[model samples]
Target chain A: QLVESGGGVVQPGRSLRLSCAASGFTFSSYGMHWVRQAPGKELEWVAVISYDGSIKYYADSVKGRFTISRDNSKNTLYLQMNSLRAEDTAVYYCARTSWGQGTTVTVGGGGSSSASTKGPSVFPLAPCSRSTSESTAALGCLVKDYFPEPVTVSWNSGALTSGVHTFPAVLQSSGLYSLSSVVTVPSSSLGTKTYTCNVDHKPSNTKVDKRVHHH
Target chain B: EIVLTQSPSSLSASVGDRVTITCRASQGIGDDLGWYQQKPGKAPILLIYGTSTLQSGVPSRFSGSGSGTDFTLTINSLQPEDFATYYCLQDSNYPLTFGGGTRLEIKRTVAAPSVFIFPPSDEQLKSGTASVVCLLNNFYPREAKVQWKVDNALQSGNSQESVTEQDSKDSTYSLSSTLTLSKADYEKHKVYACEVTHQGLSSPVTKSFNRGEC
Candidate 1:
């Protein structure tokens, strides 16, 4: 038995539609089920639709946001998800006795963070030297007053690969949130290279950048 | 071959009983095990996977434990809907295999037999005669037949049937038949088939053995 799935990267607020094409059996003779798994997590059952298309069941976790249905004319079963969240990022599979290789649907990137409805104020601190020997310099990017909680931060288009850490957002006493991303790099290249701090406030689809050059 | 052996082939339990079924792999497979529940005439439903995590919507009473070679599926306060066969599947390597299966039955039940065809051994083939065994296991409501055919032609007086025996634990009947053929005749045959017919079966269960497969 073979099952093939069709789905790709899904943008936030946009509906995610996935389909499974089946072969070697009567499409309406057996029930079709949908399953998903995060990159390194346990498998999750999404929903199942009866062979006759009369009965459809969804897991409570995705009940209102997902719909499972079949199209006999094309011998396909579909899973449509609305109001997508970051947790929805996973490889979705359609199953009978066999499971599809799976449709890789990235709901907005990493699972550790969710999209925020608003934007934040981003600022970068000048590169500074931290400890002994001065082999590396530390660069900081400050993100403040972000509405809701999550945001993504990056450095130099990934030029500075290691020694990058972003702290969790702190709830400010002023009713806003604040967070920072710090990158450590070879101090020898501080004057020869220019660094940029990029912040993406997902929900607002906002991008802010700060560039620095050692004096 | 990848072997997944399940023990306590069948067990009797009450509605509120606590039951556990075990599956042992031939080698270590980490936590890549899955547990399934199957009711008669229905597709098997995945209940627990990744060793111990329950699939969404699965009842809380059902739980899985263990990693590597040995795993167990436990049912607490079993419900009427839980009286069914449970299977363990390992996907840690290529060509995955499912366990033999453990049936959870109530004090009263009906079950269709499972069939297995044992191919002739090289020693038997080299000895001038080859014999194949067809086994029918764990079935209720006894009336059943085992017929052997060679090249689509029925073989008469060349087979020996065993008396049906009941499992001391579950009281299910098991029967087997051995079909013997001369080495010359076996080499010339295109195929050998075993057909099992029973009232519980919607259609006869047939399995064929092709030449050189053994």
Candidate 2:
């Protein structure tokens, strides 16, 4: 079995149909499974579709959004996902008792051959608030109106999180990408201190910066 | 194919308080991240897009950063329209995944409990046993306790069922407790009363029913 289609980058939040075309052995008797291996990461078990189309199993990672189907006439097993993310960049293979050829997929706005000069701008200083229990502080930042698809956000020492803890971003009626990010103060035992939100929106070198103080 | 978990499953907020929410991917997600607002009775709206682009006509106050595994969506100041549940979705990989949604509710003053102990059935009373159902309505905090008594003596009740249900439109809860007893026993003291305890009540509120009164 050898099928292809997982190569090249696609826009984020889209779908990628990883297809497995089988021959040699009876494609109907055996099973077809989709697997992924990311750069420098361990192998991941993605999904499985029985040749007859009666059985299926998706790792919790893909449950409601991923579908496993087959076209017996075409001898193809389809592992399809509608929403794509950049982290989905990986080499996917259809495995049975044996394995098939692998397809590599990358996710990003970088899918386009032409280049846009837009780079990300820095976020404003964050606002900090203590969890009601006073056990930790969350520093938050909101950014909007920038593009070309990708941006990098970071914190000094806290674990990174996205969107506000209990809020939703405005659904933009415009084209610019917008979002909010938050960072945790790992050591909440400390009384209070200043923190910052660091963002790098591509063009490879541009940046945005700001700060927050938590108590 | 990565792990993403949302924080604080739900929170209470006023119509105009600024709020922040987050989605964490186990590995990196690049610019493959987005945010969703799910209001009750409606499908989820793609707010902060998976590709970082805002949908169309939203204000500048909405925006996000980090999509290669970790990401955030923050609202500057909130509007009443912002009330709803929020979720995060990503599919940069084969198995698309999403964080559990967080429900945002408007904060408001909670009022005391409103209660009614439906009067007894004189016909059922004459027949022997009767069912006295006490309804506890319009209460905040969604929790309450009901006790049945004949005169001042507490009645464990021969056997009764209390069901708690909440309104879909509002978050308040309703509790109903039914007490069963022979009419002779109910009329021994010629009275039955229901005492209610609730989330914010300093003391239980009691409503009495007299076999002769009604």
TM-score of 2: 0.38
Q: Write the per-residue lDDT of candidate 2 for residues A25-103, one digit (tens) a residue.
A: 7777776777675543434567877658887778776678778888877778787877877667777767662455577
lDDT of each: 0.70, 0.61
Q: Which digits, one per residue and each the tens of the lDDT, describe model 1 over residues A6-55? A: 56555566687788888878987888878776543335667888888898
Task: For residues B44-63, write the lDDT of model 2, one tens digit per residue.
Answer: 45687754688776676678
For model 1, the docking class works out as incorrect
Error of 1 at A50 (Å): 3.8
Model 2 per-residue lDDT at A87: 67
Q: What is the C-alpha interface RMSD of model 2?
A: 21.4
Q: Candidate 1: lDDT of B202?
A: 92
Candidate 1 at residue A208, lDDT? 88
